[PDB]
Amino acid sequence: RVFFMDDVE
Amino acid sequence: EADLTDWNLPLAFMKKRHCEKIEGSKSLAQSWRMKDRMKTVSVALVLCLNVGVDPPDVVKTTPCARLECWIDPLSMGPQKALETIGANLQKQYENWQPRARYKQSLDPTVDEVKKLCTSLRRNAKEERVLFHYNGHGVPRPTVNGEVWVFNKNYTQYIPLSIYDLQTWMGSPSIFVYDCSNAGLIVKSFKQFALQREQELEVSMKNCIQLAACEATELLPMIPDLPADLFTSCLTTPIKIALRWFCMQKCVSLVPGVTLDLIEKIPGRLNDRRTPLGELNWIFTAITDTIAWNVLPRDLFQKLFRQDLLVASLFRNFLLAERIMRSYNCTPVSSPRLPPTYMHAMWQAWDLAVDICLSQLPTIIEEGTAFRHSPFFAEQLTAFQVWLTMGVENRNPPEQLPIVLQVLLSQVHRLRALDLLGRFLDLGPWAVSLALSVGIFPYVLKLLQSSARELRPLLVFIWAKILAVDSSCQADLVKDNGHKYFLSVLADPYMPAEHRTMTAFILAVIVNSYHTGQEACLQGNLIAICLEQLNDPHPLLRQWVAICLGRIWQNFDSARWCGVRDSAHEKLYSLLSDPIPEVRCAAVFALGTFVGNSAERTDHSTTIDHNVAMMLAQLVSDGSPMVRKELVVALSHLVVQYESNFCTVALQFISVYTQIWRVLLHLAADPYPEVSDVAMKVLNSIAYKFISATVQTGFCDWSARYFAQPVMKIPEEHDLESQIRKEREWRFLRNSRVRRQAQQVIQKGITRLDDQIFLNRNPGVPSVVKFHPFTPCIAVADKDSICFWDWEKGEKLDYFHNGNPRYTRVTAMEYLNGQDCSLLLTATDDGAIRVWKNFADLEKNPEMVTAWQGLSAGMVVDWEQETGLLMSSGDVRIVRIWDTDREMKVQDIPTGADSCVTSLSCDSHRSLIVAGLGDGSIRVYDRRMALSECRVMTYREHTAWVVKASLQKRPDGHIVSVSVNGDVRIFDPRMPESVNVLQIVKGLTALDIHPQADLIACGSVNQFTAIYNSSGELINNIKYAISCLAFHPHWPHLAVGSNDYYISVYSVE
């Protein structure tokens, strides 16, 4: 992915 | 007043299933999918810095600009400085693309670059390879198209042709140039690409170039800025942005901020909770917003969404353009981006940076707590403000990429999801826009979180996305999000609306997708749906039934799981559900469950017979949609048992015979579409291939519900809406009509001999019905239904009811007379059909609904206040159809051999009366039991009762007149007639008026006596009169003789 989704469980 | 009565009246046959055509919404061409995923497997770093020697072309100033990659080469010796700068540049690039084979070149020769680039291409033949060049220590590129590098002894700069450079390189590659005349490099690269294209007849779009300057322009020489400026903007955008901000006049607003303080800023680029990470996140959001708003969709997807490294390079290239514009420098890219230096989001970037680093002195010295920037909160507030009046398809909001960015973290994730759901609620265009921005991978990843508060927002968003684009089922199954949806659906504490949302999502996932069907089977979806089948929610039951039907669609294991769980027996309950939509969904599910027997044991045959016999009692159904789904289910049954049906059909030229009888009943259906489908199914049987299978659009029509907005207030509740104002005007007109009629009646009834008009009809006028308020009279012939007016005096419409030659339109009624009226027409064989737009200028005749009733002619009595409809005729049963549930509620026994000639009822009471051919006038009370429904039976006539009508007054007086012509006024509380009259020896037709006691009679000798309840002679009009009708409000009477003439009479 282009960005970095954090805090996803 | 009389307004409250009109408002609290249910509108029969006025809903989505009646107005909108039952069909699936056409799926749009969803191009939001990324065509391919490139990866920058390797990066080449060619650094021709030439530390310690100045190029002859440019005479550097005494202070000059000594900062390359934030390193001062002169302080640490030439070779060590070059190695350190190379390592630092590799680190800066690894900040963006950590997983890449970086192979640095420090003052390389032509052969060295040849070997490096060829080896990298051999390593990655079909993936992107980045080439980074620094021409700071070498002479400027020439117009001939060459790049200068060093020889072995470092005694002369040897050129390197760009032709050879891209010959060593491949088509998939991106080039970053940091030179003086980098525009010359880009121009020569494009010229060489054109030369290659010209030669190819007898790699232009694939290659990407980023250039520091235009061909004419020179790099800035300001001592404060780094010498390596363009790469500093590309690889370290936040540091160079803060350094440039601390050099503008905007610093005057904030004293006590210097570059020394910026050097000691706390935090890291990764931790978004720290000030530096917050600044990086805000910069990413702003650059993505500018790219999305300025660039076209195709170029935005190609550049800022293909791969991480190129997207980051262009997001930082926006900042590079803005920064270097102020120094008379224009960065150049191979795809020409429209200028973004003037975009309004740079002002927001400046404000956010100002607010963030205004607290920096306190953080450094006092060690206070860093408060988070309100940038994202304010942007989400702006998005909400746009959504407040964003119903219209105006310019898309500029904050969609900001919503995508704020979805990443958890500080504002719930609000971001709420706003995204509200935006997707607007319509399919909003969902297409959101998917185009690239929210799909992040919303998909959000399904991994165990936070229970995210479930409603996520199911709402996913329901919208799946309703718009159904290709997401593969991605949902791949990432095991169906497990998340099953967990959502298995929580009784969850609100029912989100549970039906998840049921719709699961139905879409398993829709004609064997992988998803198997995955949901292994997830025990059958049991989850069964536990939530009797839920007190119509849409939840409907979509659970649809999901059950789609699970076992061509899936024998799912059918076996349903059999073990007794799914068919539990689903039988929905066949009697009052809501027609749930009945249709249940019929669809049962038919699909039947359609996949695939020749199992005798238990399968027995269960198929059981389902068939349970569906075969659903023929007598009001809803044509449910009957069409029944026809489809029976077609599945036929396909399963083609040989048995062929034998049954050939027998007549005992289970299959009953299904054949049911299909024959459905073939002679009043509704044309159901009849056509049943006829096609029957014809598919006689000539016995797969092409005969037909699937109805009910499932997709139901799925269309989640495409439409749900949150916003319905148009009916809108007080200032045009529709409600029109209805208010109609109700005002109705009140005026009633008041005028009452005023006329209060003045008494004078002799009525005024003939408004005399016309000629094509057929015999059988039944005449007056529209209560609008000036329209509906006259039904044998093969037509005319609609005349007594004001304009012109033929408005001329229908064909559709009934065969033997049949005849016997009864007629005006449904929803107050506003948006319908026309009910019941033929003598049982066919009841409803017409819409029967007297309109710009609309054609329309058939709302139809259903075979029963099965004298046929007698019908509509009841608007309660919504019920009672039909009677030659049968000994009085049926009570409920148009709200579209099912027969009660079948009270007539208990007499003669046919029911007439039928009427009293409002607000259960006083169903019925004239009979033998002479008796029976009255029925449906409050009590069926065996006790009969109240009184008085027989004082021997003839067909022409009209045993009733008076709407509380003291109801059944004025029953037979062919003998003897009037006997009965009461429901006295077993004997109160008044007896004898009018005409031979009577043919008559009508009664509830408001005015005017019994209009007919005669064979052209006489038309209009008498009173007391029998006083009023009028004997001299011209077989077979149709009389009284206006329910006005004292108007319609006379239609045996000759096809119509007249409407009035009193002065």
Domain regions of chain B by residue span: 469-706
All residues at 6 or more sequence positions from B981 whose CB lies less than 8 Å from its CB, including other chains: B966, B967, B968, B1011, B1015
Best CA proximity match to B285, nearest among B342, B354, B237, B335: B237
User: Which residues of A touch chain B, with CB atoms under 8 Å apart?
Assistant: 1-9
Tell if the CB–CB gap between B445 and A8 is shorter than 8 Å.
Answer: yes
d(Cα B324, Cα B426) in Å, to the nearest integer? 41
C-alpha neighbours within 13 Å on the C-beta side of residue B817: 25
Question: What tokens appear for B117 in the block?
Answer: 């680039």
User: Whose CA is closest to B173, among B111, B96, B120, B106?
Assistant: B120
Please tell me the distance from the alpha carbon of residue B121 to that of residue B127, in angstroms, as a whole number. 9
Phi and psi at B71, nearest 5°, equal -135, 135
Name the CA radius of gyration of chain A, rounded.
Answer: 7
Q: Within 13 A of B842's CA, how many CA atoms are on the CB side?
A: 0
> What CATH class has B469-706?
mainly alpha
- Among the listed residues B978, B995, B1052, the one whose alpha carbon sits nearest the alpha carbon of residue B1019: B1052
CB contacts, 8 Å: A6 with chain B: 272, 408-410
Residue B781 is encoded by which pair of tokens? Answer: 């012939």
- A4 contacts B311? CB cut-off 8 A: no
Provide CB contacts within 8 A for B479, sequence distance 6+: B444, B445, B447, B448
Dist. CA B891–CA B208, nearest whole Å: 79
Tell me which chain A residue has its CA closest to the CA of residue B272: A6
What does the block give as tokens for B95?
Answer: 């900040």
Cβ atoms of residues B601 and B559 within 8 Å:
no
CB contact under 8 A, A8 and B449: yes
Among candidate residues B626, B628, B618, B623, the one with its CA nearest the CA of residue B662: B618
Burial class of residue B241, CB neighbours in 10 A (0-12, 13-18, 19+):
buried
Residue of B nearest to A4 (CA): B408
Amino acid of residue B336: R
Q: How was this structure determined?
A: cryo-EM
Tokens of B938: 């008085």
Please report, as a single letter, which amino acid is at residue B343. H
Task: Tell me if A8 and B409 make a contact (CB, 8 A cut-off).
Answer: no
* CB–CB contact B408 A3 (8 Å): yes
CA distance B1016 to B997: 11
Chain A closest-CA separation from residue B279 CA (Å): 15
- Decide if B408 and A4 are in contact by the 8 Å CB cutoff: yes
Q: Residues 398 to 457 of B: which have CB under 8 A from any A CB?
A: 404-405, 407-410, 413, 438, 441-442, 445-446, 448-451
Q: How many CB atoms lie within 10 A of CB B235?
A: 24
Cross-chain Cβ contact A2/B446 below 8 Å: no
A8 contacts on B by Cβ (under 8 Å)? 445-446, 448-449
Q: Which residues contact B144 (CB under 8 A, 6 or more apart)?
A: B188
Rounded to 5 degrees, φ, ψ at B889 are: -85, -50
In this complex, do B409 and A1 lie within 8 Å of one another by their Cβ atoms? no
Closest CA to B971 of B1018, B1002, B929, B1013: B1013
Nearest to B107 by CA among B60, B166, B57, B152: B152
Q: Do B441 and A1 count as a contact with CB atoms less than 8 A apart?
A: yes
The closest alpha carbon to B37, from B127, B101, B129, B171, belongs to: B127
Kindly provide the b/e burial profile for residues B584-599, where b requires at least 16 CB atoms within 10 angstroms of the residue's own CB: bbbbbbbbbbbbbbee
Quick check: B480 contacting A, CB < 8 Å? no
Give strand ranges (E) for B312-432. Answer: 332-333
Contacts of B289 in chain A (CB under 8 A): none
- By C-alpha distance, the chain B residue nearest A3 is B308
| Residues of chain A contacting residue B98, judged by C-beta atoms under 8 Å apart | none
Q: Report the alpha-carbon distance of residue B1042 to residue B1022 in Å, rounded.
A: 14
Structure tokens at B441: 């991978």
Q: How far is the CA of B876 from the CAs of B271, B812, B817, in angstroms?
A: 83, 21, 30
Contact B48, B136 (CB under 8 A): yes
Strand, helix or coil for residue B428:
helix
Question: Please, are residues B532 and B488 in contact by the beta-carbon 8 Å criterion?
Answer: no
Of the partner residues B311, B405, B409, the one whose CB lies closest to the CB of residue A7: B409
In this structure, are residues B78 and B138 in contact, taking their beta carbons and an 8 Å threshold? no
Q: Which of B59, B80, B61 shows the shortest CA–CA distance to B71?
A: B80
Q: Which two tokens stand for residue B357?
A: 């680093």
The gap between the terminal CA atoms of chain A, to the nearest Å, is 17
Of residues B64, B46, B49, B72, the one with CA closest to residue B133: B46
CA distances from B631 to B665, B670, B686, B983 (A): 10, 14, 16, 53
Structure tokens at B94: 């690894």
Cβ distance of B413 and A8 shorter than 8 Å? no
- Sheet strands side by side (includes B858-862): B858-862, B868-873, B877-882, B887-893
DSSP element (H, E) containing B1019: strand B1019-1022
Q: By C-alpha distance, which of B356, B362, B406, B408 is closest to B380?
A: B406
Pairing of strands B128-134, B40-47: parallel
Helix (H) or strand (E) holding B294: helix B275-294
Q: Are B922 and B969 in contact (CB under 8 A)?
A: no
Nearest-neighbour CA in chain A from B512: distance (Å): 29
Phi, psi of B123 (to 5 degrees): -70, -40
CB B305 within 8 A of CB B169: no
Query: Per residue in B899-928, is it b (16+ CB within 10 Å) or e — as a string?
Result: bbbbbbbbeeebbbbbbbbbbbbbbbbbee
Nearest chain A CA: its distance from B449 CA (Å) = 5
Strand pairing partners for B948? B960
* Nearest-by-CA chain A residue for B445: A8
* CA–CA distance, B656 with B641 (Å, rounded to integer): 9
Q: How far is CA B580 from CA B623, B669, B852, in A?
A: 7, 18, 16
Q: Of the candidates B305, B410, B442, which has its C-beta nearest A7's C-beta? A: B410
Which helix (DSSP H) or strand (DSSP E) does residue B778 occupy? strand B777-780
Could you give the 3-state DSSP secondary structure of residue B444?
helix
DSSP string, B730-753: HHHHHHHHHHHHHHHHHT------
Q: What's the CA angle centered on B850, arms B844 and B851, to 5 degrees? A: 170
Indicate yes or no: CB of B408 within 8 angstroms of CB of A2: no
Which of B329, B335, B345, B332 has the alpha carbon at shortest distance from B287? B345
Q: Which helix (H) or strand (E) holds B663?
A: helix B655-667
Q: Are B171 and B203 in contact (CB under 8 A)?
A: yes
Nearest to B450 among A1, A4, A9 (CB): A9
**Inter-chain contacts counted by CB atoms under 8 A, chains A and B:** 37
Which of A1, A4, A8 lies nearest to residue B448, judging by beta carbons? A8
Selected for mutation to probe chain A from B278, B442, B444 (highest A CB count within 10 Å) is B442
How many angstroms separate the CA of residue A2 from the nearest CA in chain B?
Answer: 5
Cα–Cα distance between B1009 and B1001 in angstroms, integer?
Answer: 5
Interface test with B, best of A4, A8, A9 (most B CBs within 10 A): A8
B287 reaches A (C-beta below 8 A)? no
Question: Which residues from chain A sit within 8 angstroms of residue B404, using beta carbons?
Answer: 3
The verdict on B487 touching A (C-beta cutoff 8 Å) is no
Distance CA B1033, CA B772 (A): 7
- B617 touches A: beta carbon within 8 Å: no
Query: Å from A3 to nearest chain B CA?
Result: 8
Counts of helices then strands in chain A (DSSP H, E): 0, 0
Going by C-alpha positions, the residue among B603, B292, B223 that lies closest to residue B433 is: B292
Q: H-helix or E-strand containing B960?
A: strand B958-962
Distance of residue B597 Cα from the nearest chain A Cα, in angstroms: 43
Instruction: Find the closest chain B residue to A8 by CA distance.
Output: B449
Best residue of B408, B414, B452 to probe chain A, by most A CBs closer than 10 Å: B408
Partner-chain residue, chosen from A1, A2, A8, that has the shortest CB–CB distance to B446: A8
Resolution as reported, in Å: 3.3
On chain A, the residues whose CB falls within 8 A of the CB of B413 are 7
| Interface membership of B308 toward A (CB under 8 Å) | yes
DSSP percent split of chain B into helix, strand, coil, nearest 5: 40, 15, 40
Tokens of B1022: 């001299």
